[PDB]
Amino acid sequence: FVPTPSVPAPDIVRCAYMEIVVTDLAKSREFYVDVLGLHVTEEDENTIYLRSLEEFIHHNLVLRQGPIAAVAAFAYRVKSPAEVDAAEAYYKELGCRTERRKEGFTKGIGDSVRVEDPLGFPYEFFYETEHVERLTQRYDLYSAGELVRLDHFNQVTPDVPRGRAYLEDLGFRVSEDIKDSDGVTYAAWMHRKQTVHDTALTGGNGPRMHHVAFATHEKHNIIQICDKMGALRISDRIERGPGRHGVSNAFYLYILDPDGHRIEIYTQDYYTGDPDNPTITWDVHDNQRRDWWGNPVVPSWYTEASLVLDLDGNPQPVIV
Amino acid sequence: FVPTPSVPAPDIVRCAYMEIVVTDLAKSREFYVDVLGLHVTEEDENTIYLRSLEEFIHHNLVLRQGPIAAVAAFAYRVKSPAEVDAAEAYYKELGCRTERRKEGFTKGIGDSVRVEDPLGFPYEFFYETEHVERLTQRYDLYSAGELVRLDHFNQVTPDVPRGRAYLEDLGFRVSEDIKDSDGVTYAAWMHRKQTVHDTALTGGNGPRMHHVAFATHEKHNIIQICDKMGALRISDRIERGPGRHGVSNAFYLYILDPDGHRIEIYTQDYYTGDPDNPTITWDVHDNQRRDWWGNPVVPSWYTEASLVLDLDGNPQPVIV
Amino acid sequence: FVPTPSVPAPDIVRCAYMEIVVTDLAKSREFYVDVLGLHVTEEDENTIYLRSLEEFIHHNLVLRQGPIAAVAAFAYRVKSPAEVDAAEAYYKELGCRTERRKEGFTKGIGDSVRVEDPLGFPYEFFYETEHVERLTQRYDLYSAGELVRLDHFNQVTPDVPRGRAYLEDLGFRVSEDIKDSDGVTYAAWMHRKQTVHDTALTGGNGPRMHHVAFATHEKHNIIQICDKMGALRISDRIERGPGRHGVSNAFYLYILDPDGHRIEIYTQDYYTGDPDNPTITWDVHDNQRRDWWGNPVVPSWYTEASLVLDLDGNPQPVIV
Amino acid sequence: FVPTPSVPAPDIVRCAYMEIVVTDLAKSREFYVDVLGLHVTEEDENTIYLRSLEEFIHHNLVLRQGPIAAVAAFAYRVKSPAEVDAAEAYYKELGCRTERRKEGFTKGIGDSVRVEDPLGFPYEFFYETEHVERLTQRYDLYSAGELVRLDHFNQVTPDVPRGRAYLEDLGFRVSEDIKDSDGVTYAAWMHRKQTVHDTALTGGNGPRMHHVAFATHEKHNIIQICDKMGALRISDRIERGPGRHGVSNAFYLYILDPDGHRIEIYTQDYYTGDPDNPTITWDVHDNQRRDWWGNPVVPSWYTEASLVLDLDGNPQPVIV
């Protein structure tokens, strides 16, 4: 197990954005903006800043042109400027490499610290961000498959029990998990905000990014995304779903972007804000734990996932 | 009563399109295309031809620039070219003014006959029409408030029993009506196709066009139209609804175009195709006959309606 | 090809009901009434009469206890009493075995003729039926997965071109078909009523019943059926879907009853009522013709189908 | 203004339940259970404990038989057992009457303190409660108009600025408010949990309970409630809506129980959890602040509200 530091954990409010490296920016823009309908906060020749309909912070996604498709950062917003200091101190005590930039690492974000965490993932903690027009009631812009908010990340790592105790120490609570009779954790859903999760851990070769997920208001919005992809003849990019998750109870869809990064569209989970919210444990042999409808899980869903970068911009080696 | 001709009635398949005269074409285009999302089949400086998502005939609506906002024609498609002849013969026997144009009255329509019917309405019967791309599966074009097909017309006339017997002679059947204890008809819903109606008769000063109605696939599409109008700050053009009709059982919305013409958006009525489909009779005092939820009916809904034109292009005088 | 008779074909209005033989009536009742929510018109120790929410004829399904699960009759309603005579005369001229019963074959149905048609299927034609309370507006009964009407049948037969030419002589029109470069029909969707089909032909070992289909009002009603089956732990009975069909454009779901008979839940196809409604032809190699989202079909969907009975109640041998 | 205590405010997690006094328990049960579909946790001859689908604490509503219809308690769950002590200390310092019961005031709740707060409202704070089966995935129980969770309370008070400053000292944040050019608050929406509100203040004769609100998953669930009430002939109990709120952005419906207590059914507001979540201020003359579609409000909605009880069970006099 990762040691529990003597300094307090930073107070994390929620997952906020992900910075992903793509190989052809124009091709990626077409998928994220023209197909999925995300809103462009701002952009230049090498970077695109996107946000969902109900977001007020500067962006939920940063697309950056690069030679190797990978995830550069999983960013979490902390409760106040002092928590950025707490985050840096906490990881330094763990012996992790850290880098602080008062001016931020991405446009629209202020003082931030990035770290190569104990599991090899590039994590960012920040508090300051530029506010932009919240498009919540801009129904003149509302598309039939509208993505309304960023919900969670999903990470692949070889040792799930080690990762779980580490995120618990950081203050995340386990709303649901999958265990065997021995009591060993195979996967866990973890949260700071009042939904089922901000991040999840899946067992496998890693560190790797399994997916980032956005929510819609209703189920028909998810169906429309599939319909539109069939009309555009890119239905081969629909990987799994739509279906109903056993774990989380969310109606879901997983699609692939042009570099193969996995995007989940999700809707309707439940409230986990209470202090003694009951953890739901599923047995590893329960056939409805993944797909409530018993649908077959595609093999690629367990084996393909995105590389993540270290703080110098190079891929972290995958432990097999 | 209007005499029953000795020649057979033309075989009418369904309501097909309406030609409306608007006072400012650019302002009307903005409402029908930019706000409601109808598809432009073709257009020129004085006329716009629009169609709904699942239509394959040339248009469901013709917008024509004119000095007086009014309805120029209610058009019905007949079963074969010979029914156009039958339509002309039938109205001639009734002594109505008729005009036949082998080349059609509107672009994309072939051989047609227009008549000033016994109630003063300009009716058109045609069979030939140019086919265009049916957009049924063009989900890349599907908007959140998509109108998928033209459903029916609604006409205001002073003597409903006279109008009902006249349309029955034409072969329309009454799926639902409103009567008093005396057995007198106050309103009637009439159809040729297998839905609740192609046209309806409402008692009042006329001849006048009460509304033309389009259908959506689901209820949330109707809600989105309201939401979008609120975002565009034109919610004062929402006249009545959304609500549930007692008569027809349809979920509905009535909005007003820039000249005040009333448009209904409707969804989910039931099948009436069987030969002995039961007529549903509602009593005039049943409070759920109009709005199933008991909502208040706006006074303007009973008093405002559009003028209709005679065959020379002049308004038919309204009998009060 | 089946010869074309010299007498006119009976005027068929729509598919009306199917008589199914089940092996354990209590187990079947639980699935059709308690799980699917169909409404019991009446029942006895050996037979159950069910109807959908918006139906006014006596029943859409008849469940009958028997030794071998099979389909005893595909019933179509004809336009008037005289069409029952025309149906008998038409099949006698084709040399088919026919049996007429003035008092009907199932309760609530009057004068009917049943025939072993040229492809081996037991077809029934009737006009008279007892009317029952139409539950259209009984929202106090409306369930979250409500089936509102019977839509179509799907039949498996070894020679599709023969069956297609036969049904067209009967007056059915082809709304969509699947053909190869050579022009050979592999499958066809055929209709009398104004929807995509009343019956369809699938190539395979037959004669066999592939499925009977019911419609819901909206897409979320179909999703609820799946959710409820997962809660009841019978998700292993969901065979294919939910998905979007390329042919027909309908949102769909296929599930299996206790004896393995296949039921489709379907919603939202389009209007085919015009006399020149364009047939849509799909190529055999178009991967979006079955499932618009490119989902894998299930081998069982092409190989498993129900036996049908001859007029003496014995199963028709299946040609392989 | 109410003085700000020197002891810290209790850490409040969310509104949790309301205790309502009804005049005929059988008539009320019929409305809450048979019509609305709430789930009975337990009941006796004089009291009914109800909860929503996704709730795990003992109840969200308590119905209690009594001589005068009124609200006996607005209950909030606090973060830990120690916060019950902090709540008692905070209100004692304000000079409010308080009553603590180690064994709870209603079944299933533990150590609780009730207070007659500065505005005259009976507030309860508790931590301990019995957990019951969370019905989240019991789709075999899911109704077409299912209420999934308790969302908020709305209170009527004569001095909104006083009440607002008081609740902010308690730690509630203002997600949206209505102000005039002068900066005076006419109404405010306040929250502890990550939705738009836990409670709201409406100006008027009070103290009175304006309404308690429950959420559904989707917009069609709210429409079904209306449809079912029309089928049961109790549409006269639908008071306002359905509509879209400007403030909060939620799709809504207000109905009346047998004693006239107002219930809101609500769905789809947005996330307010960030520490600098922007307050949205609406001007008093903006006609889309209440109903986004410009619908007329109902005078009864501003004038009628429920009496609330003091700690001895007698109604608090209403200041006019």
Ligand SMILES: O=C(O)Cc1ccc(O)c(O)c1
């Ligand atoms: O279906 C599964 O594989 C489990 C599950 C539940 C919720 C999620 O967001 C997710 O990504 C995966």
Ligand SMILES: O=C(O)Cc1ccc(O)c(O)c1
């Ligand atoms: O609500 C009403 O006034 C009756 C009604 C029913 C169906 C319709 O299309 C319509 O336009 C009016």
Ligand SMILES: O=C(O)Cc1ccc(O)c(O)c1
């Ligand atoms: O998806 C397919 O396999 C083709 C298809 C289309 C419409 C139907 O009703 C059906 O039963 C099958």
Ligand SMILES: O=C(O)Cc1ccc(O)c(O)c1
């Ligand atoms: O429409 C209004 O009157 C304002 C409003 C907004 C959100 C709510 O929950 C509410 O109860 C009232």
Ligand SMILES: [Mn+2]
């Ligand atoms: Mn996920």
Ligand SMILES: [Mn+2]
């Ligand atoms: Mn209408």
Ligand SMILES: [Mn+2]
């Ligand atoms: Mn089918």
Ligand SMILES: [Mn+2]
């Ligand atoms: Mn409210």
